Motif scaffolding. Structure first.
Motif, PDB file in Angstrom:
ATOM      1  N   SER B 359     -38.622   0.566 -11.087  1.00  0.00           N
ATOM      2  CA  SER B 359     -39.583   1.634 -10.141  1.00  0.00           C
ATOM      3  C   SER B 359     -40.794   1.946 -10.759  1.00  0.00           C
ATOM      4  O   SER B 359     -41.230   1.514 -11.703  1.00  0.00           O
ATOM      5  N   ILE B 366     -39.921  -0.260  -5.765  1.00  0.00           N
ATOM      6  CA  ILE B 366     -38.979  -0.737  -6.523  1.00  0.00           C
ATOM      7  C   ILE B 366     -38.957  -2.330  -6.405  1.00  0.00           C
ATOM      8  O   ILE B 366     -38.623  -2.895  -5.311  1.00  0.00           O
ATOM      9  N   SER B 394     -42.367   7.800 -10.880  1.00  0.00           N
ATOM     10  CA  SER B 394     -41.055   7.565 -11.082  1.00  0.00           C
ATOM     11  C   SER B 394     -40.870   6.653 -12.498  1.00  0.00           C
ATOM     12  O   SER B 394     -41.773   6.008 -12.806  1.00  0.00           O
ATOM     13  N   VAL B 408     -32.818   5.710  -8.394  1.00  0.00           N
ATOM     14  CA  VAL B 408     -34.271   5.811  -8.812  1.00  0.00           C
ATOM     15  C   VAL B 408     -34.931   7.254  -8.757  1.00  0.00           C
ATOM     16  O   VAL B 408     -34.607   7.876  -7.947  1.00  0.00           O
TER      17      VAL B 408
END
Ligand code: DHE
Ligand code: DHE
Ligand code: HEC
Ligand code: HEC
Lengths: 514, 514
Positions: B359, B366, B394, B408
């Motif tokens: 991520s 991703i 992230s 995620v």
């Protein structure tokens, strides 16, 4: 921008009056304004000179070894009186720009274009002059004076026997082709601010592939292409020490030797006491083996078999034996005060077998260390015997496989007569005392310091050359002695021969004949 | 001793009012007085506070995260207002003295002394508290709260499955025995001023032999004995960069992973962009291979086969693939803005084959990189597909070989709802969009920032644990979700659970199950 008692003005000026100090006063005057063999530029000897006198001296120079505006001189004058500076970091841009290819690989001849007996030529260093003299070994005549960097410390031969690598203490390397009509510079580069060693790759499958050069400042060594001198890799030597295992910001790169057993460079990193084995196989990704030795590593050379690198750890009074095949420290042989071998002296002892010898600086003596674990294991890595030279302050000692006398110089001894002569031993009777050869007196120079440095043989092994190192202005000479007779053979004298230090015989240097 | 607009007094005082800054304000307040997630101590936010207020605040502290005499406080007050300092060099003495053996190797039990299901225990970091919580995976009860260093970044398991290594960001390592009646500290040591990673030797013939720890300051990594934590070697990472090939005074040691193929440690050195392969075979003489990657290396983990170290070069937006068997850089796969995998997420794609995912921080996405050259060579080392998460900011993404959903997190996104939830993908249909799980809302905390960090599975692969990272004072929790149902299973809440960040499942961490 202020110091402890001299003119203080600011900004910008600090950065520039110091970039002008590292212009052409970096190699001549030192990193921290030291200044070996000349009169110092330390804040106090200079603050005593004054804001008025300093302007004067920089403006007109002096007659023993001396472009800028009155403003830049006024600057340098108020600014050499300032706190000592922040030594620049010489990375890849600064190094790649200094790289100049004077002749292309294709432009260079396929074979020799001169009558020169190349294996018996002497690459003589002219320190204060910043040049090298290519002296002939038979005719005793300077064939060519080549313009190089300041105070060319050593000269190394490219394994092939064609190119001559010379490095200045100002870190300026120059590659010279000995096959050209008149042997001249084919490539040059500046690898730092202050350096000592240059070296080419000498293992089985790499003869002349890469060129390495060690620097005193920045604490690094730079690997180049051994054909064009193209910087490929630069590695920092800043790290942890071997003794106290503490950080050190300036571990200087001393001696370097190419491993004949593996694709490596054996790099002596001084202050840390680590001998680095720099693998070149894959150059964009370097494999380094940090072999701990003993603090303050310096000079040294190969044993009789080219297997063991016998290096001196001077301020530890030990000699480190590096095994280039098994890649480990064999032993830390304890020798006398402040050892100084140069490349050393290798001969075959009758009652102890093959050995390696070293003269000293604090003490005198010539320590005899055994270099054979196979046939003489009881004597190997021990100071078995011990000989006695004239006195302390000795830099080099020499011998040759052809004939018999062992020579030990003493360049830095207070006793004038001793610092102007060499102790010649007879290997065929080691209990017999040395014969003092009046080298400097034979030169017929008259006035001066007349220091005798480095015994260097010719290819044949019949002549032994000495350098009578005397001041820039004084009359200096090169004394050639006949090894068999122990008498004077010739004296090379010339005014172009300003401060002769290191003499390197092409074949003897190339094939490591010591 | 003067700065640009605050009280100035001299000597001695500089050295001491700063040695008192590195006392217990080194790890809490930073190296260059930075101060992540708290209010800064930069010269200007503090000069505005004043010579009067600063004395006051240091003297009585504050209620959100605050011994010295009035003189030392007057000092610190006039001296935090001063120019930023000269960060100490942490060598072997400072490191060997900090080494404390709390329990001997013989004093330790031969087998387990508790009913604890050790492979399913969670070593949860309590950042601001400077402790770790040993949470059980089935009963959801804190079994033991152990006192460690400040802000324990990661927790690593000793390959055997017995010892738990935890490192503080203040560079304090603590070894914990999980076989004791009540698992407590059996060894501790401080390896620098600021660190991130600890690691044990995990190759075939060395399981638990040596322990390594990487430091942010000093630019070094320290190798210890993996049984007693005895400092044996320390190596500096100060050197030349990979991109511009220039000197860098502070290349920080990021992630470290033990090579399962050779007796090495794969060390990520940030700023230089060099991934070091530190061979331990012969430890008193280290062999390091400098594999050039891409600048600003950070985190990463192993692929499905434990052969390729997939590391992220965050400020270069590439992922470097390190081949641990052939020992070379396989490729520099170009991914989106500011990649952040953690250890990453490994699964088997139906139409592309075995992959590794990551991520991002600047971008969302991703990226799916193929990790198989043997059966899928046309997709290996390429960003073949690309999925889309909620948004940027992230840190981690997770999966497990047992079952199906890919998680995620997004901890640092300005959108409150996004920074309080996770994007759950279904691998059995990748074209299908994610399901937003309201993790922080399920926690029932009420007031706060309620940031969701790190999806960590249990041994069995049925539960997925989250850390609801909320302020030191606020109510913080750990949210457990059932992977199969995608519903809430439990919420571990407690006041001792101050700022839960990293949760490490003993078996999953040990066997590298990601
Ligand atoms: C590291 C090193 C080597 C080994 C190189 C190698 O083989 O790879 C070496 C060898 C050498 C050799 C090699 C001889 C050989 O054949 O082995 C020579 C010619 C030489 C001329 C000098 N050396 Fe040298 N020497 C230094 C460094 C070194 N000297 C110093 O730092 C020192 C102590 C102080 C300085 O002022 O630089 C120093 C002073 C001198 C001199 O004063 C000499 C005589 C004159 C000069 O030019 O400075 N050094
Ligand atoms: C080098 C490094 C690793 C890889 C270690 C390894 O596997 O060998 C890592 C992994 C990690 C992991 C490992 C998770 C995993 O299972 O892979 C955790 C728990 C973690 C908690 C945090 N990380 Fe981390 N992280 C840094 C450094 C690193 N983080 C930073 O320098 C940074 C960007 C800034 C800082 O303030 O330190 C940073 C901020 C954070 C946080 O803010 C977190 C959430 C809270 C905290 O404690 O500071 N980092
Ligand atoms: C570059 C901008 C500089 C600066 C700052 C100075 N020099 Fe030189 N210097 C060198 C030598 C061989 C001497 C001694 C011989 C002689 O003086 O004739 C000196 C001496 C000085 C001094 C005075 C020392 C004193 O008596 O106090 C000073 C102030 C000085 N220099 C400054 C050598 C060189 C060169 C080697 C050829 C070069 C080029 C420089 N100096 C350059 C500079
Ligand atoms: C050791 C001698 C020091 C020094 C120089 C200071 N601290 Fe701390 N500090 C930390 C935390 C978590 C806070 C924020 C929460 C709060 O204030 O309650 C602070 C804040 C400060 C400030 C003031 C910031 C401002 O508003 O301008 C200053 C001047 C300060 N500190 C100095 C954390 C810690 C600790 C972590 C538990 C420790 C221990 C220290 N600080 C130690 C010191």
């Amino acid at each position: 921008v202020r110091t402890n008692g001299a003119p203080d003005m600011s900004e910008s000026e600090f950065n520039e009056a110091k970039q002008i100090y590292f212009q052409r006063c970096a190699g001549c005057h030192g990193v921290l304004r030291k200044g070996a063999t000349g009169k110092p530029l330390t804040p106090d000897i200079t603050q005593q000179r004054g804001q008025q006198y300093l302007e004067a001296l920089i403006t007109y120079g002096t007659p023993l070894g001396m472009e800028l505006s009155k403003e830049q001189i006024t600057l340098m004058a108020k600014y050499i009186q300032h706190t000592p500076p922040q030594p620049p970091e010489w990375g890849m841009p600064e190094m790649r720009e200094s790289w100049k290819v004077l002749v292309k690989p294709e432009d260079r001849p396929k074979k020799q274009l001169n009558d020169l007996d190349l294996p018996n030529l002497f690459s003589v260093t002219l320190r204060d002059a910043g040049q090298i003299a290519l002296v002939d070994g038979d005719s005793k005549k300077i064939v060519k004076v080549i313009d190089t960097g300041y105070a060319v410390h050593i000269s190394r031969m490219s394994a092939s026997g064609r190119y001559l690598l010379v490095i200045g203490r100002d870190a300026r390397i120059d590659m010279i082709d000995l096959w050209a009509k008149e042997p001249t510079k084919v490539a040059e580069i500046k690898i730092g601010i202050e350096a000592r060693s240059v070296e080419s790759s000498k293992f089985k499958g790499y003869e002349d592939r890469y060129t390495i050069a060690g620097a005193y400042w920045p604490p690094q060594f730079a690997i180049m292409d051994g054909e064009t001198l193209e910087p490929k890799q630069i590695v920092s030597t800043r790290g942890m020490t071997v003794d106290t295992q503490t950080y050190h910001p300036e571990p200087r790169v001393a001696a370097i030797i190419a491993s004949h057993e593996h694709p490596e460079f054996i790099v002596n990193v001084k202050e840390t006491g680590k001998v680095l084995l720099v693998n070149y196989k894959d150059i964009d990704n370097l494999t380094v083996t940090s072999i701990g030795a003993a603090p303050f590593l310096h000079d040294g050379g190969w044993d009789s078999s080219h297997r063991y690198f016998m290096t001196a750890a001077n301020n530890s009074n030990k000699v480190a034996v590096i095994d280039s095949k098994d890649r480990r420290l064999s032993a830390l042989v304890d020798v006398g005060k402040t050892p100084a071998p140069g490349r050393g002296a290798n001969f075959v002892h009758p009652k102890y077998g093959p050995v390696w010898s070293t003269s000293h600086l604090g003490d005198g003596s010539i320590s005899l260390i055994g270099t054979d674990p196979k046939n003489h294991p009881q004597y190997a890595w021990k100071k078995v015997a011990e000989l006695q030279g004239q006195g302390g302050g000795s830099l080099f000692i020499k011998t040759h496989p052809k004939s018999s006398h062992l020579y030990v110089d003493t360049t830095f001894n207070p006793d004038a007569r001793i610092s102007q002569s060499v102790a010649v031993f007879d290997l065929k009777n080691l209990d017999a005392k040395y014969q003092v050869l009046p080298i400097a007196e034979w030169a017929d120079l008259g006035e001066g310091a007349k220091r005798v440095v480095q015994p260097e043989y010719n290819k044949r092994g019949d002549e032994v050359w000495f350098s009578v190192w005397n001041g820039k202005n004084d009359s200096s000479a090169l004394v050639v002695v006949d090894d068999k007779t122990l008498k004077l053979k010739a004296v090379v004298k010339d005014p172009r021969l300003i401060t002769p230090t290191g003499k390197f015989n092409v074949y003897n240097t190339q094939h490591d004949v010591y």
